[PDB]
Design a protein around this ligand. Structure first.
Ligand SMILES: Nc1nc2c(ncn2[C@@H]2O[C@H](COP(=O)(O)OP(=O)(O)O)[C@@H](O)[C@H]2O)c(=O)[nH]1
Length: 184
């Protein structure tokens, strides 16, 4: 199966991919891949990893938009060959970023992207990372579910809190990914 990973920069996506696969990606061995899509062999499956969305110092905002366009085009073009998507979010930061963006009338990246995947009928699991920094995870997940337009009945199927840093619930996230792939 093919699994795409996506998320804003610094949410812990490359760390999560390493916890899941034992393969270090985006650590510099390969320079010039910072703004590119990479493929990872995960036993007999394939992970296609999108460059992180959003701001990164040194990354001009025009290049930021270009990257986002490239990710959109790849996922639109390969949608029929994508079995499941994992959107990695930073559980501590995401709700507060969503609130400040809505205040100024902009659509938060996380919300925009999860809703985009839904328009494409791609089953999506949200890895709510950095659980070790989150004092009320249920509250965070309930907030994100309302902003992402996720039905109450589907919250526990969609939102999986983990700590890629310490390993918390990584096996549960792996089980979910494979369960979604099979159920598909
Ligand atoms: N506290 C905490 N920090 C994390 C976790 N996962 C990743 N990080 C930290 O978040 C930063 C970015 O992680 P990285 O995997 O390089 O992010 P990416 O840009 O989304 O690939 C780092 O300093 C990681 O140590 C986590 O679960 N908990």
């Amino acid at each position: 199966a093919t699994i795409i990973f996506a998320g804003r920069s610094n949410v812990g996506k490359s760390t999560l991919i390493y916890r899941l696969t034992g393969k270090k990606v985006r650590r510099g061995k390969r320079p010039g891949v910072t703004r590119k899509i990479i493929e990872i062999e995960w036993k007999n499956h394939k992970i296609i990893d999108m460059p992180g969305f959003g701001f990164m110092m040194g990354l001009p905002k025009e290049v930021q938009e270009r990257i986002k366009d490239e990710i959109v085009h790849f996922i639109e073009d390969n949608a029929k060959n994508i079995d499941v998507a994992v959107l990695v979010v930073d559980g501590k930061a995401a709700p507060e970023i969503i609130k400040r963006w809505e205040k100024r009338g902009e659509i938060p990246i996380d919300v925009e992207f999860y809703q985009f995947l839904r328009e494409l009928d791609i089953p999506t699991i949200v890895a709510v990372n950095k659980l070790d920094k989150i004092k009320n995870v249920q509250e965070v997940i309930n907030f994100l579910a309302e902003k992402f337009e996720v039905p109450l009945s589907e919250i526990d199927k969609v939102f999986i809190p983990i700590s890629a840093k310490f390993g918390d619930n990584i096996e549960r996230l792996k089980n979910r990914i494979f369960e979604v792939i099979r159920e598909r």
